[PDB]
């Protein structure tokens, strides 16, 4: 199955985000950090190891997808390259984001970050950096990601995902 | 517990937990610190298809509490749900050093 951006009608004051990665503990911590605060909207977080998802009918529509990659592991990079082939091209227009973990400790790194830079540039999407094991750093990334989610869902007038594409575009 | 979060892949997690519990039992594991395997098997993967001789390898496992590190690999996502029997058969076979042929 191929995931589609506008398959279902939106809910009332609701935003949904999907996190795809191999490390489950990091995903759980990130979801908790996102949900701890209070906001005007209603938030829902879905956790998955890879795509395609198991089939279900009650799934609400997905507004934003974040691919988190561990720089200390080749397995995570291979998993994300495999997952990237099951989402339709229409869904990359301002609704996909890449998150890279572990650049703080360079000695542990198995992946040269030229690789993730080139991957993000190839798929026309932003690339973010955060060390998710540190709670203080994770807290601010959760809020930035919540704001991006609110923009994508249509909860800020005058700004849409396609507009967000030009704001976050890199010069080279 | 925080019903806003939805855990997909839940059935896979419960299945791997059940398999690990069945394979490694529920008793406290006896404390070892080392295990050695000697391999004399053929490479089977275009690559070295014409070769007819075994590939000679020797590998060792070392841990402060072995059989406790191994038990936690599959839930953490580093191994598949059933481990190979060579790793889960230490106390039952009363074996610590192994030799494997094709």
């Amino acid at each position: 199955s191929v995931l589609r951006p506008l398959d279902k009608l939106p809910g009332l004051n609701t935003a949904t985000i999907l996190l795809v990665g191999t490390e489950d503990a990091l995903l759980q911590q990130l979801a908790d950090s996102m949900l701890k605060e209070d906001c005007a909207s209603e938030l829902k977080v879905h956790l998955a190891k890879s795509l395609p998802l198991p089939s279900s009918v009650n799934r609400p529509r997905i507004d934003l997808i974040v691919f988190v990659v561990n720089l200390h592991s080749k397995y995570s990079l291979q998993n994300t390259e495999e997952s990237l082939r099951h989402v339709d091209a229409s869904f990359f227009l301002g609704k996909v984001c890449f998150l890279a973990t572990g650049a703080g400790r360079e000695s542990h790194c198995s992946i040269h970050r030229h690789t993730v830079v080139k991957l993000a540039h190839t798929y026309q999407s932003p690339l973010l950096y955060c060390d998710l094991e540190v709670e203080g750093f994770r807290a601010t990334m959760a809020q930035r990601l919540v704001r991006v989610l609110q923009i994508c869902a249509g909860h800020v007038p005058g700004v849409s995902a396609l507009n967000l594409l030009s704001l976050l575009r890199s010069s080279e | 517990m925080d019903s806003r979060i939805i855990h997909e892949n839940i059935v896979e997690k419960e299945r791997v937990q059940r398999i690990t519990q069945e394979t490694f039992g529920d008793y406290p594991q006896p404390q070892l610190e080392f295990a050695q395997y000697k391999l004399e098997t053929k490479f089977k993967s275009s690559i070295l298809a014409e070769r007819e001789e075994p590939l000679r390898c020797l590998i060792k496992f070392s841990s402060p509490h072995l059989l406790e590190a191994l038990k936690s690999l599959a839930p953490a996502g580093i191994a598949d749900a059933p481990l190979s029997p060579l790793l889960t058969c230490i106390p039952n076979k009363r074996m610590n050093y192994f030799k494997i042929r094709d």
Binding site: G11, L12, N58 | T41, P82, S84, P85, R101
Partner: peptide, 29 residues
């Protein structure tokens, strides 16, 4: 048909809620 609740029903709900293979390796070696 889990009764797709009418918008009106869902809306009031939210408003109100603001208070809460083990034989194949032993055969190869």
């Amino acid at each position: 048909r889990q009764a797709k609740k009418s918008f009106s029903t869902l809306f009031l709900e939210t408003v109100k809620r603001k208070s809460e293979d083990t034989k194949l390796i032993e055969d190869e070696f």
